[PDB]
Amino acid sequence: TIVGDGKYGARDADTKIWNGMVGELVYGKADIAIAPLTITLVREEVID
């Protein structure tokens, strides 16, 4: 499946929501993401 918004996604500053493909792994709309997902700190604490 292709993520709809076309973003890798980062945490919004105010609403604290995730968009994009990490928004599908945290919120459970998909089970795994084999994609160019750059290892950072803000993405380590929400998905492994």
Binding site: I39, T40, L41, E44, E45
Partner: protein, 48 residues
């Protein structure tokens, strides 16, 4: 190269969150810029 921990130990989550905080702040780079080039007998300026 990875900092190792025994399997299932309590230092699995904070050690992992520490290394990605060090590479974020550039502190791994400033410690790799140093021990390979500060203690370097012939620097790139030196042969230059």
């Amino acid at each position: 190269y990875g900092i190792a921990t025994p399997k299932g130990s309590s230092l699995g989550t904070p050690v992992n969150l520490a290394v990605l905080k060090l590479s974020e702040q550039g502190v791994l780079d400033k410690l790799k810029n140093k021990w390979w080039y500060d203690k370097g007998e012939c620097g790139a300026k030196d042969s230059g």
